[PDB]
Amino acid sequence: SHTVKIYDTCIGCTQCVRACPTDVLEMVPWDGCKAGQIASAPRTEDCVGCKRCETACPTDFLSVRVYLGGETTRSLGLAY
Amino acid sequence: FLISWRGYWQELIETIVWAHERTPLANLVRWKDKPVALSIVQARLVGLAHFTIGYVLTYAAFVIASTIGKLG
Amino acid sequence: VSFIKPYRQDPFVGHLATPITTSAFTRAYLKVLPAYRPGLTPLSRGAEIGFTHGYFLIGPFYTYGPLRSVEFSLTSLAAGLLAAITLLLILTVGLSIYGQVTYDVYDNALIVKLVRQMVGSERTQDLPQIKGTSELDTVLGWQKFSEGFFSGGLIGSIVAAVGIALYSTYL
Amino acid sequence: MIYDSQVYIALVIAVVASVLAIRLGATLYN
Amino acid sequence: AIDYPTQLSLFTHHVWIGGFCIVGGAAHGAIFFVRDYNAANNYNNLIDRVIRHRDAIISHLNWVCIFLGCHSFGLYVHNDTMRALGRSQDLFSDNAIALKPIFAQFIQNLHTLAPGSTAPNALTTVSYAFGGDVISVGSKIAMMPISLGTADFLVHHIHAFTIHVTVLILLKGVLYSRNSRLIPDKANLGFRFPCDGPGRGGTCQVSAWDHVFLGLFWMYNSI
Amino acid sequence: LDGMIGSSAPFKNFDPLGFAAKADQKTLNKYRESELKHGRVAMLAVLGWIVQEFWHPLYDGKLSSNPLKALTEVPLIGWAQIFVAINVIEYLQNKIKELPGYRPGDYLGTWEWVEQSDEGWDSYQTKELNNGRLAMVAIAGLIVQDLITGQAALEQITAGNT
Amino acid sequence: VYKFPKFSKALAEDPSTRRIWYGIATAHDFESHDAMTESKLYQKIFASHFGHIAIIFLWTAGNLFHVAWQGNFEAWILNPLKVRPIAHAIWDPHFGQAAYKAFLKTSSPANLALSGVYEWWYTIGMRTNNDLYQGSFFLILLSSLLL
Amino acid sequence: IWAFSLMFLFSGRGYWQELIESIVWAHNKLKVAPSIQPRALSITQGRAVGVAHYLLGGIGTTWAFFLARIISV
Amino acid sequence: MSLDLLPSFFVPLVGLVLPLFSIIGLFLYIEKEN
Amino acid sequence: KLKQSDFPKFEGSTGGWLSAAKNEEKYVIIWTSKDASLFEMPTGGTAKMNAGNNVAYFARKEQCLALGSQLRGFKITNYKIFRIYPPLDITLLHPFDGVFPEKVNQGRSPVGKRDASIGGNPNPASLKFQ
């Protein structure tokens, strides 16, 4: 399964979570930004690696980073 | 392998997978590894290998045959 | 009327009930084939499949091989027969390795029920899972299937060679 | 022209070099 | 007819224009599917039923393309390797294993017999290509019976194979323009997009535009 | 002579001799099977009669265009293969006949999809039956005319032996 | 679907054919293998170097043997400017009679040698097909040493 | 032109963007960096340029070949 | 057995038998489990 | 006509699940609709909702989530996606805590959070042979 990391540059704009096609990211409470929220990656087993999450990231060099790793039938997007 | 990239070969492979799974007399035989398209880096490597091998073979054939057939 | 409907009333399967997948002709024709004919042991299925396959395999090798003859030649027939037999050997090798790497069962249609009843808390894929309940889906079943395919292929190739010689000589 | 004995013993020595190769191959592990 | 440059240029130009326009028609069919296709307005109609079994269509077209390519091109390669090996009697030639286009020759015979039999008010065949006399103007041949042999069989099947592969690429683009097993929401990405990402093993060129790109390549090959 | 398919306008439920008024359902199913098989075979026979008369590309020409004469000119080893193919087809039909829900002439298994048949389906089945009946009459006439006169269909018509 | 990429558990868990493809292409990237240390890395590289030198010596021995057995080295010595060196003989069942006749050189179809080994070995003082055989024997012995 | 097409068909956008980065560094060093930031052609546009050049080169090669051959003879 | 029979003895042997056994072994190895 | 009365009025497509979603895992999405709206399947073509309980099965989580995202355009929000293993092993997936992941809910802990920016990542040469 791929690896997804969140960095404290998160501004809690939720654009990553609402762009994930496989429900990998979610918004959790935080105290490091104005919005009081930070993205989390608790379901990386469903991560497919499409990187839509970091295409919607407005922070300078990203706050969500996807590191491709071992492959799985879920991560390979295999309907068969 | 260089011009056509992945994604176009994954959907075709999915169609082939459906065809194999939904045909009699061949359902008895099933793969152990799920057939998938070659990865992007693997596809680049395979296209480069074909390009290089063809390049080397065609030029070796040309140089050798031309020298032999022209200079006796 | 509509002649295409979802397969077995399941609109989510990747399949359809067309006049070809689920027609009475298709049902009977596939149920008379050796692979699905009822009352056949796996050895019998393999033997029939091998006989038919060697019988029609000797044809292209003898007719279009490297040693053809517009007239009848014993050398051409021998070449075609040997090529067909070696191709059957290659196919039998493929069958053997496929069965070796695919199944780990010696008696099916039971282990599934045993693990659906007496629990299967083990490494799985042998107790649990198990795709298919046919006798062809076992280590023993596939081994006998390959043996039958190989023997029947030899016999059918020889029979087809004899028939070809008779047709070319007496006609 | 080399003899049958010359080619035969070269083949035998080549076999010995083959057994040494698999021993190195197996020692470099599966 | 005796201005050979004009005939060659006209044929090649018009065939090129035709191939380009066909690829464009496929492209705009894909564009319609992505943009202007309404699922609600097309419940259980022909368009809906085609999308519902797109797999079967594409898989069988794939098999046909492989069959045609294997056969046509491998017969070409078999001829090449038999000639390279000094086995001239093993080729797919007229003086060898012969593949006579009997169906086309039958049609040619039917046309050259049409005047007076099926077209009784005709004085001459529609074209001398089907048969007849050699028509020459100023010692230059205008038209003449175009004989069809094993060489025309192979090249005609090459044409069929290339056309089938181009149709495969374009039809796969049109049918899988809205969704697939890879990207179930490909219509939300539009007609023209590079990919969905390096995930799923790699989702390059999944668009429908990237299919009009590959189909353009294959149309170039075929034409 | 029932609610069976095949009743057309000129003679609805055409059983003047009352063959069906006394038969049970099994005998009527047998009658429908025989009628449909005869109709299909006769349609094939009529089409073959005509086409053979004005086109016989196979067997390098030869095989005289008059039917009932080419019947004794086929290599007789091609007759055996046609016979065996028909036999295998009818063996498959026999196997079909034991499938659940089988209908007399239905070898496609349309009963799987067609529950609560429409008027279009009944009309098409009646069309097939009527075309088969017309072809049965036509092929009987063809064979009888060729036997008594010796000329084929388009040959007798062309000369004017009517 | 397991145990092929013994050096990588991440690949061995791949349910697709990508595992086989990546197993080939990552076999020599020892630094990326599972349960990897520097000592094992250098030792494996050392052994691979030995096997590689053995392969090189076996290749040279094969060239020497095939020139000695199926070549025309001795004939080429007496007329180096007219005799074309022969690399090795050809036995291909797919040949027609025409191909056999065209490739026929002396006693059997053979390939001309374009590696220049004839001139190199002649320069360093080889005059007999038994000198080449000695070199092949010695090089196979050296390959055995390296293995 | 046909061979030129293969640069766009075989390569990718990231390499050209990173090369444009160094070219832009040189321009900034000489105070001549344009206000309109130079970016490598998008992936889709790279493919479009590649296919257009490929078609133009191949069709033009066949065009010249056919015309010269059939005009000479 | 002359030396000129060695090509006909070895070329089929190597170029056909060795592929068959090598394919068998490689397929068995890469299709193993744990 | 169909196995269950709550299935959407879909005519079946050769784009549904395969042998994989019989021995590895299958995904089911359930939702309740006020109207029998006509919607597009993530796999094939157009299906008709039921004016009530609707249940659909798919081979991938992404297919179910694409269907759910389409449902939001119909003002449908109560859709829930489950994962079913080879036996009836049902696991609720998408509304994991009953609140959509885009809305912050108490009781969620950060997973995969690094307390630094990208520039703070360690050098790869210091991550050799571990």
Ligand code: CLA
């Ligand atoms: C010379 C180069 C070349 C060749 C051989 C092919 C071959 C093919 N392409 Mg193509 N393609 C090419 C260049 C080429 N392409 C380029 C440059 C592009 C870039 C735009 C594409 C883009 C492209 C797309 C987008 C598609 C294809 C498709 C196809 C396949 C059509 C089906 C077919 O004929 O399979 C049969 C195979 C052949 C004819 C190849 C030769 C096989 C020989 C003659 C017979 C078998 C030999 C035998 C097995 C050898 C065994 C011995 C060996 C083990 C040692 C076929 C594999 C389509 C596809 O997927 O298939 C349906 C498809 O959708 N191609």
Ligand code: CLA
């Ligand atoms: C598709 C392309 C193609 C085709 C058709 C052929 C055809 C042939 N090659 Mg050939 N060849 C090719 C490509 C091709 N080649 C290429 C690319 C190369 C270079 C690698 C060669 C190199 C080559 C050599 C070196 C030689 C041949 C030879 C031959 C001949 C005998 C082959 C043989 O034993 O058949 C075996 C055939 C079969 C086992 C049967 C396969 C076909 C069956 C009939 C398919 C049936 C399908 C069926 C209809 C499905 C429906 C069934 C129904 C019941 C539903 C034959 C004419 C030999 C020769 O000399 O002949 C003149 C020979 O020595 N070939």
Ligand code: CLA
């Ligand atoms: C009862 C049907 C029937 C019978 C017994 C014959 C018998 C004959 N035909 Mg014939 N034919 C038929 C129908 C029939 N035909 C039809 C319907 C057509 C129109 C396509 C033709 C067209 C035709 C031509 C063009 C020629 C013959 C010729 C011949 C003679 C040599 C056999 C041959 O080559 O057949 C060839 C038959 C065909 C090419 C077409 C047969 C197609 C069959 C009937 C349909 C499919 C049958 C299927 C296997 C079973 C049905 C499946 C399902 C309904 C259960 C032989 C006397 C040859 C001859 O010597 O003429 C004097 C010849 O050259 N026939």
Ligand code: CLA
């Ligand atoms: C460095 C070597 C080199 C290279 C790279 C090229 C590159 C090119 N040449 Mg070329 N050429 C060269 C040397 C070279 N030439 C030399 C030394 C000569 C001698 C003067 C020529 C003579 C020449 C002519 C006369 C033609 C080219 C053409 C072409 C273009 C082909 C484009 C393409 O995609 O082909 C795609 C390839 C094909 C569509 C098939 C190639 C033709 C094959 C051999 C015919 C076989 C077809 C056969 C029926 C089977 C086909 C099956 C399959 C196609 C489905 C391309 C720009 C041609 C062109 O404009 O495009 C084709 C053209 O007309 N060149």
Ligand code: CLA
């Ligand atoms: C790497 C060196 C090398 C190479 C490339 C070749 C190449 C060839 N040899 Mg050969 N040969 C070699 C060394 C080599 N030889 C040596 C050292 C000997 C002395 C024992 C021979 C003795 C020999 C004979 C007697 C014959 C050939 C023949 C042939 C030809 C057919 C292949 C064959 O039958 O092999 C058979 C080869 C052997 C039985 C000897 C083993 C070859 C060496 C020792 C193994 C090298 C392995 C290599 C380094 C890597 C292996 C990779 C593997 C794991 C896949 C082919 C041109 C045949 C020929 O001339 O046909 C026309 C033939 O009849 N060879």
Ligand code: CLA
């Ligand atoms: C080093 C590699 C190699 C070698 C030595 C051969 C050798 C041969 N090939 Mg071959 N081939 C190869 C690679 C190779 N191939 C590859 C890679 C391809 C794909 C590109 C082909 C494609 C090819 C084709 C398409 C054809 C051949 C054919 C042949 C045969 C030559 C024709 C002849 O006169 O024999 C005549 C052959 C016989 C008289 C009978 C030979 C039958 C087998 C080979 C005998 C094996 C005996 C074996 C020990 C039996 C085991 C026991 C068993 C009874 C249980 C010959 C056996 C031709 C042939 O004969 O087809 C079968 C042929 O048509 N080859």
Ligand SMILES: CC1=C(C/C=C(\C)CCC[C@H](C)CCC[C@H](C)CCCC(C)C)C(=O)c2ccccc2C1=O
């Ligand atoms: C070179 C290259 C670039 C860089 C190319 C650029 C920036 C194009 C620059 C075009 C200049 C600025 C204008 C055109 C100048 C020409 C001289 C005008 C055309 C000639 C006329 C006769 C038409 C990419 O962006 C790219 C993207 C994706 C895949 C491959 C590639 C790729 O290969």
Ligand code: SF4
């Ligand atoms: S890849 Fe990016 S987008 Fe796709 S799932 Fe993993 S995180 Fe969400």
Ligand code: SF4
């Ligand atoms: S590789 Fe696939 S994903 Fe990465 S850029 Fe090129 S297209 Fe987009």
